[PDB]
Write a protein that binds this ligand. Structure first.
Ligand SMILES: NC(=O)c1ccc[n+]([C@@H]2O[C@H](COP(=O)([O-])OP(=O)(O)OC[C@H]3O[C@@H](n4cnc5c(N)ncnc54)[C@H](O)[C@@H]3O)[C@@H](O)[C@H]2O)c1
Ligand SMILES: NC(=O)c1ccc[n+]([C@@H]2O[C@H](COP(=O)([O-])OP(=O)(O)OC[C@H]3O[C@@H](n4cnc5c(N)ncnc54)[C@H](O)[C@@H]3O)[C@@H](O)[C@H]2O)c1
Lengths: 312, 312
């Protein structure tokens, strides 16, 4: 596999880089791209680690070199929010960045699996899809909004509440990636039960976890190291599936049948061509049904904002 | 085990943090300290990763909280060099930082195993030893200059030359950590042979690898991600030995019998009390014997500079 990381010099990009360098299968290639001029030196730094993964870094305005022959592209370029901001407040700086980078992907490697990490994900994934459509090159099985951080956050918060080993708990999370649209499916966590007070409290802690880190960093940024970890998990799942491994399933924000919104995050069976099947969200509790119904008008306004930017 | 990282908000500290969070044994504690006010937020970021390792971060002028009950302390605080500088040029900014932090270690956790990562290591380790002596608390089996990056750099450079799997080659490196005092023992690499031209060229590439990254980053710093990786390897070796694991051996810069200089890096058998035995450097080639003899006056000037700072 070749994996390209666009936005490699940032806080997220460097942590992701470190993890992919040390965890990608033997024989893999990793290319790093960022406009920042330190980027080739980030690749040299990493190239001193003894693993059988070839790494090169690229700088400047053209990402073509990084993108040639890429199977997976992971996009983490863009600005972080400051205390007192919402994710949607990032639209004005980041919409242009994502539009610019996906046109480059559309020209150079239109068959790659593309993971959008750039905030606000609910909207930027729709920007990506519209760009790829205009280029005559959209495949809805190969475009992903990366929501994996919500998953590993829920796993951590549940295990500590319920006295479980953190690596042993997996919770499904559906919806989107904003404070209102993150819905952890706590009724479906095997082997654990929660009171309704535990469900309310946990769901809030999970929805507000991004603002918790932003507040804690005090103007020094948002989640970088945990997000690096989450994105490396998703990327390695993509790579595993693309190499033919069976039964790899991840939740991600993806264009589907539209039963709830155009884009919606749900569990997905991954295969050699991207998403193999979009799995059922299953049976919801009364809390979960209610939370879902309540999020739906905010979700599709997020989507329409993205499509607007590209189509007007 | 409790492991404390002093200098946790820097480029090295954050990569080290990420790796220790994800790789330390279940039941471990990790505390992060830095004067930078973002540090508690670095710990919150990391605390969202689902592993059974407790993490807390501390800021301000007092490191006591981070240091209470620590078994291993890893010091990576200090300034990076810029293009055109030598490691020794960092003495004026970094000597004070190391003196300050080791006095805090001497008060709070005098029985911890201490790894000095701060440059220039040949000199700063001697600063550390003199501080701990003045505090009546020096144990020469528990003070380490961290040279592991020279090792993993050599492993990478050899494997690519000789068509080996990078994870399968281990090369002993003795001496110190400066351009003149890094001596890779290429005559002792099992299963590989080198021409004398290959030995000269490889030894140079290895000695100048730090300047290669500094040049490549263009004022954006020195090696951070690879150094994080190297320090995490050393820290996990320390932890393994302290928990009673057998036959863990690492090269590190350590006060020994003085046959070459006061401090000298050589292979060490690690045990429950720090270094268990200081191993023989073995039989040297004619190149290696010569390189060793030639480095010795520079090494002990490095040492005497450190002792001077503390003792005058
Ligand atoms: N939805 C999610 O779960 C999720 C996850 C991770 C990140 N994100 C978003 O990703 C972005 C990450 O920011 P960060 O924390 O790494 O901040 P950062 O400022 O540390 O990193 C951002 C990088 O983008 C680079 N950059 C800007 N435009 C570029 C372009 N055209 N091409 C390449 N590089 C360019 C910058 O030079 C920088 O290195 C934010 O929008 C964040 O909110 C969202
Ligand atoms: N000998 C080796 O192999 C080796 C290995 C790694 C690092 N080093 C040295 O370690 C230092 C690492 O720099 P970096 O690349 O991370 O640069 P950086 O600037 O990114 O990080 C340094 C950190 O030190 C912090 N700091 C300064 N004084 C502090 C103090 N009193 N206590 C706590 N925090 C404090 C800063 O706020 C910063 O976060 C340099 O001297 C480097 O040359 C040497």
């Amino acid at each position: 596999m070749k994996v390209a990381v666009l936005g490699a010099a940032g806080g997220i990009g460097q942590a992701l880089a470190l993890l992919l360098k040390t965890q990608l299968p033997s024989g893999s290639e990793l290319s790093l791209y960022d406009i920042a001029p330190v980027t080739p030196g980030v690749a040299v730094d990493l190239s001193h680690i003894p693993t059988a993964v070839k790494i090169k870094g690229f700088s400047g305005e053209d990402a073509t070199p990084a993108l040639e022959g890429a199977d997976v592209v992971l996009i983490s370029a863009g600005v972080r929010r400051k205390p007192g901001m919402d994710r949607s407040d990032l639209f004005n700086v980041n919409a242009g960045i994502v539009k610019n980078l996906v046109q480059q992907v559309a020209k150079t490697c239109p068959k790659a699996c593309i993971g959008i990490i750039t905030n606000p994900v609910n909207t930027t994934v729709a920007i990506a899809a519209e760009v790829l459509k205009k280029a005559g090159v959209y495949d809805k099985n190969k475009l992903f909004g990366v929501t994996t951080l919500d998953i590993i956050r829920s796993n951590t918060f549940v295990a500590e509440l319920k006295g479980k080993q953190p690596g042993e708990v997996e919770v499904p999370v559906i919806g989107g990636h904003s404070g209102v649209t993150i819905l952890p499916l706590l009724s479906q966590v095997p082997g654990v039960s929660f009171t309704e007070q535990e469900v309310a409290d946990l769901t809030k802690r999970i929805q507000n976890a991004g603002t918790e880190v932003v507040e804690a960093k005090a103007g020094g940024g948002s989640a970088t190291l945990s997000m690096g970890q989450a994105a490396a998990r998703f990327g390695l799942s993509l790579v595993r599936a693309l190499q033919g491994e069976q039964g790899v399933v991840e939740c991600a924000y993806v264009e589907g049948d539209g039963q709830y919104a155009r884009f919606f995050s749900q569990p997905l069976l991954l295969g050699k061509n991207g998403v193999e099947e979009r799995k059922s969200i299953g049976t919801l509790s009364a809390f979960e049904q209610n939370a879902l119904e309540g999020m739906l008008d905010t979700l599709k306004k997020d989507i329409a904002l993205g499509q607007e930017f590209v189509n007007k």
